[PDB]
Tab-separated table of C-alpha atoms and ligand atoms in Angstrom:
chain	number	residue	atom	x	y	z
A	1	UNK	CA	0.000	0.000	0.000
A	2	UNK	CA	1.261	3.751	-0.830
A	3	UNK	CA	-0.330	6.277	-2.132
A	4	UNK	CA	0.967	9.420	-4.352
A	5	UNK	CA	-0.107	12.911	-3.559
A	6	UNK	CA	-0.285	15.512	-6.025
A	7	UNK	CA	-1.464	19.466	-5.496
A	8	UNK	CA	-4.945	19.915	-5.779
A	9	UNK	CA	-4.740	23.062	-8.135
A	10	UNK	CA	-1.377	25.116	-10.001
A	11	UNK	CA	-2.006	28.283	-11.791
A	12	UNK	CA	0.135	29.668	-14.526
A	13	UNK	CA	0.271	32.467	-17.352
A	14	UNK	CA	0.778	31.026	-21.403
A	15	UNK	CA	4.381	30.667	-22.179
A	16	UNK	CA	5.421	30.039	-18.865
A	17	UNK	CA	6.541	26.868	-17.465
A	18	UNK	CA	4.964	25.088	-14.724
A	19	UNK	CA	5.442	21.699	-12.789
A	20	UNK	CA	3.554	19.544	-11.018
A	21	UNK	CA	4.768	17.153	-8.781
A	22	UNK	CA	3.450	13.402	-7.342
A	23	UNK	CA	5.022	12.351	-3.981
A	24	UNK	CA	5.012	8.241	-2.895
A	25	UNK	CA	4.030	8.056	0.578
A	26	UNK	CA	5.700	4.539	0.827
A	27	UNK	CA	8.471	2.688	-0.880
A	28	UNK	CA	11.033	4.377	-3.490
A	29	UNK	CA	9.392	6.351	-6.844
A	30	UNK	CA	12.059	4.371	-9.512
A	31	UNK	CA	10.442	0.793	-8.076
A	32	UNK	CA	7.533	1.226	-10.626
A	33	UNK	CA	6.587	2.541	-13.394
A	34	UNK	CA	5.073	6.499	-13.765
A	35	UNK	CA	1.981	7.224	-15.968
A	36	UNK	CA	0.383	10.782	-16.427
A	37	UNK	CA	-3.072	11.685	-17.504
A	38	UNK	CA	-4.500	14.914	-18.864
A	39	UNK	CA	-8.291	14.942	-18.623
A	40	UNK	CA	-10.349	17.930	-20.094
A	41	UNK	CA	-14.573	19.258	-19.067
A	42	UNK	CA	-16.448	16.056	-20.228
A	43	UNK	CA	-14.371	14.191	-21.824
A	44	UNK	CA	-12.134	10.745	-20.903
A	45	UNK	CA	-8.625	10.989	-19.483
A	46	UNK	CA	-5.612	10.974	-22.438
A	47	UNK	CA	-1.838	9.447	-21.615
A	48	UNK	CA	0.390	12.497	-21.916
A	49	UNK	CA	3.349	10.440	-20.471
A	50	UNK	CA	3.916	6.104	-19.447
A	51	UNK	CA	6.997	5.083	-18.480
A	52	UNK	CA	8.245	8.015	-16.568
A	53	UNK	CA	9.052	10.143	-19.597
A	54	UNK	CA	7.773	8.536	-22.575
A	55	UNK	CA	5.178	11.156	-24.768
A	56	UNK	CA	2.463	8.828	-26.673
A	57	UNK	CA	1.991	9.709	-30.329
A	58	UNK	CA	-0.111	12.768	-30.706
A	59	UNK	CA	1.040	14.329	-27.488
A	60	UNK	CA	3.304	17.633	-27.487
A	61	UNK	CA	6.746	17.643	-26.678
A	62	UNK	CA	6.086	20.615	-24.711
A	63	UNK	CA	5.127	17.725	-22.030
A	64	UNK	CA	7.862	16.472	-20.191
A	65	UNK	CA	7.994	13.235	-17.166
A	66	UNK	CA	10.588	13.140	-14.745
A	67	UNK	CA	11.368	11.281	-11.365
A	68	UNK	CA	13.409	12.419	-8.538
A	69	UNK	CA	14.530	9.496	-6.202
A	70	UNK	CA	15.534	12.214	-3.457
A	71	UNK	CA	11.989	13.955	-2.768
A	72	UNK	CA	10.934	10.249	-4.367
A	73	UNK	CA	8.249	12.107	-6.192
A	74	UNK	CA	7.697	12.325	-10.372
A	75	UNK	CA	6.646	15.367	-12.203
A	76	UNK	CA	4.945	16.469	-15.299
A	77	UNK	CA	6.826	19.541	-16.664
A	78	UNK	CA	4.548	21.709	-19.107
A	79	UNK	CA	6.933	24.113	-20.885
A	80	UNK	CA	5.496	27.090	-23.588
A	81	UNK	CA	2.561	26.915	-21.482
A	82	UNK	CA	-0.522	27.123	-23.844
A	83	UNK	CA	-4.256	28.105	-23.046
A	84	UNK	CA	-5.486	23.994	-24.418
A	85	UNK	CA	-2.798	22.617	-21.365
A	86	UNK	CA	-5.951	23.901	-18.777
A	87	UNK	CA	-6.657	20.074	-17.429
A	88	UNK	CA	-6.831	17.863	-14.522
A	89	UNK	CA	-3.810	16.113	-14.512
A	90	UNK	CA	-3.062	12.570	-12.929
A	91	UNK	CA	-0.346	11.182	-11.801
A	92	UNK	CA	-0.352	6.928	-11.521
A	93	UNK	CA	1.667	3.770	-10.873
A	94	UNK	CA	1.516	0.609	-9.328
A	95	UNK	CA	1.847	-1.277	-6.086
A	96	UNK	CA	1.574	-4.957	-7.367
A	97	UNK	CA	-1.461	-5.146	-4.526
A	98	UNK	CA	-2.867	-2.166	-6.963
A	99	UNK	CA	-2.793	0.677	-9.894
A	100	UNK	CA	-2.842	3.896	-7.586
A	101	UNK	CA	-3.411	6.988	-8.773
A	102	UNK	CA	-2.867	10.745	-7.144
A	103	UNK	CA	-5.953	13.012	-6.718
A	104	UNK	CA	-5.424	14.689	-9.331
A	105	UNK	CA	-4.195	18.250	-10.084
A	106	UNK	CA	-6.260	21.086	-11.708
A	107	UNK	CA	-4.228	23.019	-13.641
A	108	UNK	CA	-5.543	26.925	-14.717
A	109	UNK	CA	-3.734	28.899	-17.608
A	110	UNK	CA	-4.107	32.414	-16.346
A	111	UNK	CA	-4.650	35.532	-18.414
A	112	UNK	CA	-6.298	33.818	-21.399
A	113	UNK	CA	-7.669	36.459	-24.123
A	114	UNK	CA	-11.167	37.408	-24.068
A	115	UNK	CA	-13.403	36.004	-27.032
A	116	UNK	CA	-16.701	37.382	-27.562
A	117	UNK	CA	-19.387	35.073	-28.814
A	118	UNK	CA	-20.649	33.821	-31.888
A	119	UNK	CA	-24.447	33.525	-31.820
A	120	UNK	CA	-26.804	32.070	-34.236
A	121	UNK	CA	-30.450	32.023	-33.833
A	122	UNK	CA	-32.537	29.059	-35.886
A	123	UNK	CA	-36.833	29.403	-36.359
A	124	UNK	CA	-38.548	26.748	-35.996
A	125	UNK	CA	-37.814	23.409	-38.481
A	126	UNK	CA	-40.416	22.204	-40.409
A	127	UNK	CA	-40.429	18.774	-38.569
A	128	UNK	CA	-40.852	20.059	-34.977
A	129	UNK	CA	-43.539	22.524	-36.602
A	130	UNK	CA	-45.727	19.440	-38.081
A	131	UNK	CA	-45.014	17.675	-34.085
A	132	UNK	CA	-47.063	21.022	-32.974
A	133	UNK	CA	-43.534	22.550	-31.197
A	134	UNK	CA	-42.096	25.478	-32.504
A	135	UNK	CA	-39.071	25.371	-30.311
A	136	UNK	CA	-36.146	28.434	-30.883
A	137	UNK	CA	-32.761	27.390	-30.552
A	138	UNK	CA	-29.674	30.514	-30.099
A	139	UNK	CA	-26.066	28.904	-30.352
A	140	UNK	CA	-23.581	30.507	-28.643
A	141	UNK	CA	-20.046	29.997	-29.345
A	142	UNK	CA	-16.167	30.519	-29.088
A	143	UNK	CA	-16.659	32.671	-25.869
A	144	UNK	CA	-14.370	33.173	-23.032
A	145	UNK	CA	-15.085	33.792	-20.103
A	146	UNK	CA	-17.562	31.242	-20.039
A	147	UNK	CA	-20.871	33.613	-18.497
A	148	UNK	CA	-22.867	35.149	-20.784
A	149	UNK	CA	-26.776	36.733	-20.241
A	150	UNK	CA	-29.448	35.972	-22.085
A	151	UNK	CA	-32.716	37.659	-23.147
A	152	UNK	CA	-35.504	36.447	-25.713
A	153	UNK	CA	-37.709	39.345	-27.127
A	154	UNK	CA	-41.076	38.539	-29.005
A	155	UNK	CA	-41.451	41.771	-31.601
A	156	UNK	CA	-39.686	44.062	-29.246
A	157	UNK	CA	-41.275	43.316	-26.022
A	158	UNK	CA	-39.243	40.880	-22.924
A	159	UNK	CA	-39.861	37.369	-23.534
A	160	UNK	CA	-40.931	35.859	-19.435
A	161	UNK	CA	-41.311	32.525	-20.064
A	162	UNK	CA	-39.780	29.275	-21.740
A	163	UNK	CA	-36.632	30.343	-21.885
A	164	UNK	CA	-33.626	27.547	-21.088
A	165	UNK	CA	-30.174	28.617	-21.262
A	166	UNK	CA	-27.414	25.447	-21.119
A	167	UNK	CA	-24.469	25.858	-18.337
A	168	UNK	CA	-21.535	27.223	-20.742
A	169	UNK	CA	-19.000	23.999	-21.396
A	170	UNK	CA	-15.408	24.435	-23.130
A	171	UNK	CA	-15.123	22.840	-25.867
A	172	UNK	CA	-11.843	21.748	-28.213
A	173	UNK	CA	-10.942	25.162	-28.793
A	174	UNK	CA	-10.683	26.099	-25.223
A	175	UNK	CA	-13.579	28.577	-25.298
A	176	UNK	CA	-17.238	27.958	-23.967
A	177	UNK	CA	-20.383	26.861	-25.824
A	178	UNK	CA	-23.624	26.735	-25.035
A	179	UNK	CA	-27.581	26.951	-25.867
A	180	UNK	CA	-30.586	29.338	-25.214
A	181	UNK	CA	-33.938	27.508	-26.344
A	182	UNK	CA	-37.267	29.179	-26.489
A	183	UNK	CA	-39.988	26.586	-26.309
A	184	UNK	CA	-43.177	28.048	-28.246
A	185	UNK	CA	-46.329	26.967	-29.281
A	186	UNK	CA	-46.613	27.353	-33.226
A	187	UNK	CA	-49.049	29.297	-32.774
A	188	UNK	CA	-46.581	31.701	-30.441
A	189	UNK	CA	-44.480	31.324	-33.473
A	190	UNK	CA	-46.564	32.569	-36.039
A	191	UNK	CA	-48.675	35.151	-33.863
A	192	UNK	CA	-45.475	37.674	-33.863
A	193	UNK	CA	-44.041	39.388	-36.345
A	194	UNK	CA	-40.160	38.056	-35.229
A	195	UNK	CA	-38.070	36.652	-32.027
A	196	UNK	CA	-35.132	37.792	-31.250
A	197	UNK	CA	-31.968	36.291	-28.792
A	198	UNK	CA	-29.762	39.040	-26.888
A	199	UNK	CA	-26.306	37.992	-25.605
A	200	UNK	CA	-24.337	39.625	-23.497
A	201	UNK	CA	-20.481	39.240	-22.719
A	202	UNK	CA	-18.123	41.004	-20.689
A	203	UNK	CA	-20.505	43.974	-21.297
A	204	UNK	CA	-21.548	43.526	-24.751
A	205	UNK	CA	-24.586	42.893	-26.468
A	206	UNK	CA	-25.441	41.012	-29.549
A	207	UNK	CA	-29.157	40.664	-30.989
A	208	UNK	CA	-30.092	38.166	-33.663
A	209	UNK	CA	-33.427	38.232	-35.128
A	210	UNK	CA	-35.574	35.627	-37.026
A	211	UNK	CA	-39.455	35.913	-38.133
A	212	UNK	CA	-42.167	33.166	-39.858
A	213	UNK	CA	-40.863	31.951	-43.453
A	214	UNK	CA	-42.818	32.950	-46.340
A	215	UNK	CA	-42.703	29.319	-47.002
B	1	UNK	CA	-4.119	-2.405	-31.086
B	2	UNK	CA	-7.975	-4.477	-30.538
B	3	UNK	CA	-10.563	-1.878	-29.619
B	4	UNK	CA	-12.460	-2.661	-25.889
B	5	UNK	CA	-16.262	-1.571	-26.456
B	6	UNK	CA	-18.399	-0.781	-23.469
B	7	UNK	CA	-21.942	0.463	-23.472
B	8	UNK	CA	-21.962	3.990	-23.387
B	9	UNK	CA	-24.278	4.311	-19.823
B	10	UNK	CA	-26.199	2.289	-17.378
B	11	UNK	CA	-28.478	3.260	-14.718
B	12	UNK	CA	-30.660	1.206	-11.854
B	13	UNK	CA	-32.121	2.523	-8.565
B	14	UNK	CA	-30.027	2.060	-5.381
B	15	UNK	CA	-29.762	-1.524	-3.777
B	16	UNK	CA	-29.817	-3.080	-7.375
B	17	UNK	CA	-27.327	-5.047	-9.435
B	18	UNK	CA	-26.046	-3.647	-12.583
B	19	UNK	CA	-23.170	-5.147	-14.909
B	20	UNK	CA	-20.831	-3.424	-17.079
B	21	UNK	CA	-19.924	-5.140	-20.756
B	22	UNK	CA	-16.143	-4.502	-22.224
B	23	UNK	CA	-15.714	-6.767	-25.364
B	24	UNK	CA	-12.528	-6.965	-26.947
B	25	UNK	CA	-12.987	-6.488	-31.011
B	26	UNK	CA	-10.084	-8.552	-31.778
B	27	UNK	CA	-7.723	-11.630	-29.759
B	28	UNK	CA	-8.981	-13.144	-26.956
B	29	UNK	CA	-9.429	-11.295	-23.545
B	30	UNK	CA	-7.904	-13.863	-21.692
B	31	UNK	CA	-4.690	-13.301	-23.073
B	32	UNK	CA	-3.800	-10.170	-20.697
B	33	UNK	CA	-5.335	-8.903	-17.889
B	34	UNK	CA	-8.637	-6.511	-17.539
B	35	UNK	CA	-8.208	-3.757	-15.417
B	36	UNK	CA	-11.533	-1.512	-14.332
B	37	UNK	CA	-11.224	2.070	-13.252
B	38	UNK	CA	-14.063	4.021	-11.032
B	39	UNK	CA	-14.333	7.910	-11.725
B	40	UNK	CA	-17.000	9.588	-9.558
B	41	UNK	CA	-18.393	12.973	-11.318
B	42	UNK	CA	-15.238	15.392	-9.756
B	43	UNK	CA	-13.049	13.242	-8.059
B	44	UNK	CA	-10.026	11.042	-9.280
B	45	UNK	CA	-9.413	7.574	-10.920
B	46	UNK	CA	-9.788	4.612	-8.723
B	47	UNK	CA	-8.883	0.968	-9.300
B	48	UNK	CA	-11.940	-1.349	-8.300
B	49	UNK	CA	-10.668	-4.171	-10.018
B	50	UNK	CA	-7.156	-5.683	-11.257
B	51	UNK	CA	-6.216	-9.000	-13.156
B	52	UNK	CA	-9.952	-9.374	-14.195
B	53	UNK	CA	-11.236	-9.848	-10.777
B	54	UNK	CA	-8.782	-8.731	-7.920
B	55	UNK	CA	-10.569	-6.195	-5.654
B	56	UNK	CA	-7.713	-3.399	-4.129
B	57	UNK	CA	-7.444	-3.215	-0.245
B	58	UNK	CA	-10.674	-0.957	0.626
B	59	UNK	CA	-13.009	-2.408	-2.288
B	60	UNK	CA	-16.225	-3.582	-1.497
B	61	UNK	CA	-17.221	-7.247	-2.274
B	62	UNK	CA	-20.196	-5.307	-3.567
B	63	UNK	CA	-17.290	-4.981	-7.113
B	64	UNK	CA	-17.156	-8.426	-9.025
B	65	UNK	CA	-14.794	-8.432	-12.284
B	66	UNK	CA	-15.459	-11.604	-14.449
B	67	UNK	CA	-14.297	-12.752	-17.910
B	68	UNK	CA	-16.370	-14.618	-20.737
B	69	UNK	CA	-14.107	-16.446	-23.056
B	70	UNK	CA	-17.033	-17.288	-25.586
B	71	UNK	CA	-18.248	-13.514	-25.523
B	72	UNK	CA	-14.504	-12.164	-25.443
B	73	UNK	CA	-15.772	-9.617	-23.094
B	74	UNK	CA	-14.964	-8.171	-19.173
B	75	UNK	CA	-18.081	-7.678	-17.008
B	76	UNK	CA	-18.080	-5.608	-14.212
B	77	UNK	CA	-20.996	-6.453	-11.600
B	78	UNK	CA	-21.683	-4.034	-8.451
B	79	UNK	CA	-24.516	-5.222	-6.351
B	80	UNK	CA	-26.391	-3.309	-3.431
B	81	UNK	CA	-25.791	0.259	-5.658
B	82	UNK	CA	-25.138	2.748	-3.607
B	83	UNK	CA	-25.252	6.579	-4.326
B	84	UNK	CA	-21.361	6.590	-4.163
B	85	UNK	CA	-20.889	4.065	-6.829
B	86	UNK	CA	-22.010	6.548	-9.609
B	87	UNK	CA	-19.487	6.952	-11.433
B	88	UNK	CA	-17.448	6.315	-15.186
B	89	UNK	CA	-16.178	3.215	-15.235
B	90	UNK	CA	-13.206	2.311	-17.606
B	91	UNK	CA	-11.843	-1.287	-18.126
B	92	UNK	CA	-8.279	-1.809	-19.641
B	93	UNK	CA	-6.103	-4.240	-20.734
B	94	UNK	CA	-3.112	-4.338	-23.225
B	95	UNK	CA	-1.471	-6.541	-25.955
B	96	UNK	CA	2.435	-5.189	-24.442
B	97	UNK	CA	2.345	-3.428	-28.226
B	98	UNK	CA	0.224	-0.854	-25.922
B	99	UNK	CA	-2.471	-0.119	-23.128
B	100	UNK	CA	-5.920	-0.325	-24.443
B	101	UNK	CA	-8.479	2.068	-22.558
B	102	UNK	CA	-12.444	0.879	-22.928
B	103	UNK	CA	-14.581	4.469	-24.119
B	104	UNK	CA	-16.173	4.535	-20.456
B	105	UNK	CA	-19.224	3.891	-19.153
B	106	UNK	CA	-21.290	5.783	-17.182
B	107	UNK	CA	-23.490	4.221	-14.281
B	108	UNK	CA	-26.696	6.804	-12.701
B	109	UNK	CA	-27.824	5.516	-9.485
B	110	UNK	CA	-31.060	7.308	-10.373
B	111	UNK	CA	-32.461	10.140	-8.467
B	112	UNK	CA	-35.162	10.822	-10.069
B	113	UNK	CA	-37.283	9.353	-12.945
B	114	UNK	CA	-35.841	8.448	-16.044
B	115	UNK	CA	-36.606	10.544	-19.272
B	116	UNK	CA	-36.063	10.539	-22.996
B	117	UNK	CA	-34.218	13.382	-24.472
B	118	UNK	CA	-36.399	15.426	-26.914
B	119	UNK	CA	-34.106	15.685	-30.263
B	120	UNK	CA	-34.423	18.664	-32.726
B	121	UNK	CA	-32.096	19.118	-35.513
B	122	UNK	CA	-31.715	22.815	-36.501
B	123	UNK	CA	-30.904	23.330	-40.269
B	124	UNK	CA	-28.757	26.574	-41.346
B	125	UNK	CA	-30.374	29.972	-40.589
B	126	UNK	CA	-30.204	32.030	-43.742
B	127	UNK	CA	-28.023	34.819	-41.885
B	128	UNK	CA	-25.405	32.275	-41.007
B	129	UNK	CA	-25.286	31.106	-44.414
B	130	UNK	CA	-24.530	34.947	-45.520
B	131	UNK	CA	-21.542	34.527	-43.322
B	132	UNK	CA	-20.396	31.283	-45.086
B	133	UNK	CA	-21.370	29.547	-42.566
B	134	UNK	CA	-24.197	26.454	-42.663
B	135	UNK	CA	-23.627	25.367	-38.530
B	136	UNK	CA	-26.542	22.590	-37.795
B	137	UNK	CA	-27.206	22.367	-34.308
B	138	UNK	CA	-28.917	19.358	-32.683
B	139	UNK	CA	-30.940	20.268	-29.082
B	140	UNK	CA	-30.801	17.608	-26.863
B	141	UNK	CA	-33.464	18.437	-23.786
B	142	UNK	CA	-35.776	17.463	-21.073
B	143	UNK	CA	-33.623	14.092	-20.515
B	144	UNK	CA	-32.737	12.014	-17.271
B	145	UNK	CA	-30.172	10.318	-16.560
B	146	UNK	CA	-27.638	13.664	-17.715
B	147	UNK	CA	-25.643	11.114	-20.639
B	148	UNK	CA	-26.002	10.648	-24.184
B	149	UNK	CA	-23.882	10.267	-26.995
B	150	UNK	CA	-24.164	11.963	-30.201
B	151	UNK	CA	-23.025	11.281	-33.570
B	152	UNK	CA	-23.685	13.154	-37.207
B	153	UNK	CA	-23.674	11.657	-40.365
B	154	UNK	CA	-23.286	13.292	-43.815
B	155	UNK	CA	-25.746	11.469	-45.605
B	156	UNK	CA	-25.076	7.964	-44.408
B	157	UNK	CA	-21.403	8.081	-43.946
B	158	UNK	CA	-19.971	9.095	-40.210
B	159	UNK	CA	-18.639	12.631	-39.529
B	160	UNK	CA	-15.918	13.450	-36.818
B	161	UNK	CA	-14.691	16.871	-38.069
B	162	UNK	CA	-16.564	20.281	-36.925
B	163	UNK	CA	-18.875	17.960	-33.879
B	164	UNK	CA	-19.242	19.774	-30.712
B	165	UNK	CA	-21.648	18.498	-27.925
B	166	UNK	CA	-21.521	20.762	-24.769
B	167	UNK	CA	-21.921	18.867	-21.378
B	168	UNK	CA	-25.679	18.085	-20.245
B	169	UNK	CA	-26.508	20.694	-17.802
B	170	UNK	CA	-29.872	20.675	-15.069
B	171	UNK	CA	-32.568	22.998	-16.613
B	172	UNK	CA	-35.294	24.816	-14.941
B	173	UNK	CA	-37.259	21.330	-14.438
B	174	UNK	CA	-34.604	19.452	-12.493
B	175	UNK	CA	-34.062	17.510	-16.563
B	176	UNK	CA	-30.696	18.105	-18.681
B	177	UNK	CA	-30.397	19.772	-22.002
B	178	UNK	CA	-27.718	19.753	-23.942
B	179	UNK	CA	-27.000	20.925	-27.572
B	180	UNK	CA	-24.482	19.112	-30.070
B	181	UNK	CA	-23.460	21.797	-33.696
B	182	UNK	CA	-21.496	20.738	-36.660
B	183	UNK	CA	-19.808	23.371	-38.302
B	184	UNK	CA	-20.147	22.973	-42.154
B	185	UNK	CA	-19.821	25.170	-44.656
B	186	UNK	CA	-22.434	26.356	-47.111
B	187	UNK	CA	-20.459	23.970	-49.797
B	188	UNK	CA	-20.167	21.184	-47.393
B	189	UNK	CA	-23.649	21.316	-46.354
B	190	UNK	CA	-25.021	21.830	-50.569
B	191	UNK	CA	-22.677	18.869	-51.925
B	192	UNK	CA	-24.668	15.910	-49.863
B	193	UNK	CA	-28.423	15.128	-49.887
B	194	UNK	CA	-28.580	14.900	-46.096
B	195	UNK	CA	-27.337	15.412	-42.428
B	196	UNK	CA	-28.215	13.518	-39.315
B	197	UNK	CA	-27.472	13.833	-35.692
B	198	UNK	CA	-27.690	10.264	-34.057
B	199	UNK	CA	-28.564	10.435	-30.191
B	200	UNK	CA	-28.515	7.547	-27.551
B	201	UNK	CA	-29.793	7.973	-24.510
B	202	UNK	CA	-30.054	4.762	-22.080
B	203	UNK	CA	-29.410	2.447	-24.963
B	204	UNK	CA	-31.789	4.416	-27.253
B	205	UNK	CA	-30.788	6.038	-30.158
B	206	UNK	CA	-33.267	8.292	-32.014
B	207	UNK	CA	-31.907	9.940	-35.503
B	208	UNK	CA	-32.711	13.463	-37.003
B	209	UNK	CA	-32.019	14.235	-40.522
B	210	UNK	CA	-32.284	17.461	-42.566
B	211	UNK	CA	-32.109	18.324	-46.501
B	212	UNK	CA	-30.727	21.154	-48.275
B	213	UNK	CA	-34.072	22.525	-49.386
B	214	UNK	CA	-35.249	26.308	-50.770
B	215	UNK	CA	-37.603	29.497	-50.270
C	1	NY9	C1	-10.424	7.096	-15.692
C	1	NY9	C2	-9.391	6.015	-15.870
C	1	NY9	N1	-8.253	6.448	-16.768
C	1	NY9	C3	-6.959	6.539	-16.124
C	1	NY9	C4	-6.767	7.984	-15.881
C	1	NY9	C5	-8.391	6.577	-18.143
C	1	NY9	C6	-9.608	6.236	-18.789
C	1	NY9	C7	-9.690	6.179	-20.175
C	1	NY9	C8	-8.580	6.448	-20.984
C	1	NY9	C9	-8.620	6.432	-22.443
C	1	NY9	C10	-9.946	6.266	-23.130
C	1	NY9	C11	-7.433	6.666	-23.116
C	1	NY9	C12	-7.254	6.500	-24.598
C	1	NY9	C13	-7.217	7.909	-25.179
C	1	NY9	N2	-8.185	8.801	-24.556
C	1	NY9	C14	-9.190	9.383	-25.255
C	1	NY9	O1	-9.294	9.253	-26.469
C	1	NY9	N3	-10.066	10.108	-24.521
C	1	NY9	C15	-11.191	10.834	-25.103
C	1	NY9	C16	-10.776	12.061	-25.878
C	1	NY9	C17	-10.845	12.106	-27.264
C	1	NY9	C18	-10.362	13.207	-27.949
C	1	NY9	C19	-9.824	14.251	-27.215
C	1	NY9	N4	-9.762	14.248	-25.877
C	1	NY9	C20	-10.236	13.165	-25.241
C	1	NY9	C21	-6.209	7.032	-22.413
C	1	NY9	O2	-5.147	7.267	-22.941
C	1	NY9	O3	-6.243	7.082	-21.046
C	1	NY9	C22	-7.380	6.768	-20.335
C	1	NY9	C23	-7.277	6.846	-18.953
């Protein structure tokens, strides 16, 4: 039985360098074998190092394993720190009695530009019309920070009800996604002369607008 | 490098018995050892089973690991759920070529009723098409348990590039929505007679296609 014990969190600005470090409460680090894990928002766990130091295919070189038999700890070393690197990060070996891993390390890229949001606003499709839904969906994209306001206007006037907005995820890019949905009635829909979605970001506002086809 | 294939989620109420698949596409599985790895929503990686059926120190005999030779598959059982046992589960195993993660699975101890996902497919808004742009977005709501997987196809043929699915998030009715887009172009989306987002929810899958059409 040992265990390995990583920090909880690191912080660091793009460019930088930054370590993180696994200690083994018991026995000597070099007796086994050192994996590391990167793990982004909703997604599975990806080998960034096995083997102590060995990168898998696909994985930068700006990652870097490394064992010191003195503090008898590894470490993941994350040179030309870039915005994507923002992870949990797990450290793992073995104990023959077990595969133990450390509890993990959440690592936070500081100072990362602001990116206002692309928004798209979609009517009504034909086949959720003919289902007797006339459902509003506003796409929000490629933002960062991830909090954004919504507001849903019918004509001009505040839309109060039916109104979802998703939590904002990040998504491959680093920046946040997420959804606004307006569920209406069809006859809602076709009752007003348009709907409109109004995002805000880091104090500004965008406004799409969409109204009944002439189809 | 075989390919381990788990179901994608499972759910039961707490004080059931639920089992976990992981079939090996190719070899047999009893030619190297199945690992399976417990990640609770937050939290870090933990080994419930080793060697196909070797419970770590601290386990619960509540975890069984098994092997079928004539299925070529890994089964993880966990009897008496509890609330803590919701989780992803992983299994793992290797050829020595390389390590061979399963995709995950996750397991809902349910809280609450279940609930099919309503699916609407979204086809471009003419604005976004002004903007060379022809982004389809799939809305994923009103669903419990908070998993699914989606997948697009262009016409009939599977689509990786341009997918993002945000993470389900807890809407105003204590049910997830979630949204999945697939950034095509207006050429991309003109040059094939369909495009459908495929989503499977609890071992469902329902399928929504849209058509270039006109007006
Ligand atoms: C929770 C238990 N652990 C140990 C930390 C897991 C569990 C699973 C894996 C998998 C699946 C892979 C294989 C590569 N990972 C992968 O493709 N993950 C999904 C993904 C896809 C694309 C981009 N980012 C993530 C992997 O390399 O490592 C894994 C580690």
């Amino acid at each position: 039985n040992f265990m390995l014990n990583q920090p909880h969190s690191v912080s660091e600005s793009p460019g930088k360098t930054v370590t993180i470090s696994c200690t083994r409460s018991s026995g000597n680090i070099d007796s086994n074998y050192v994996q590391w894990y990167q793990q982004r928002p909703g997604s599975a766990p990806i080998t960034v190092i096995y083997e102590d130091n060995q990168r898998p295919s696909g994985v930068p070189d700006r990652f870097a394993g490394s064992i010191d038999r003195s503090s008898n700890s590894a470490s993941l070393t994350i040179s030309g720190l870039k915005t994507e690197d923002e992870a949990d990060y797990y450290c793992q070996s073995y104990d023959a009695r077990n595969v133990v891993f450390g509890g993990g390390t959440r690592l936070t890229v500081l100072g990362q530009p602001k990116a206002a949001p692309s928004v798209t606003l979609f009517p009504p499709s034909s086949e959720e019309l003919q289902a007797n839904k006339a459902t509003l969906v506003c796409l929000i994209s490629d933002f960062y920070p991830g909090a954004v306001t919504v507001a849903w206007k019918a004509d001009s006037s505040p839309v109060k009800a039916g109104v979802e907005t998703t939590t904002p995820s990040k998504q491959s890019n680093n920046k946040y996604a997420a959804s606004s949905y307006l569920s209406l009635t069809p006859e809602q829909w076709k009752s007003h002369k348009s709907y409109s979605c109004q995002v805000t970001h880091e104090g500004s506002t965008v406004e799409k607008t969409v109204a009944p086809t002439e189809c």
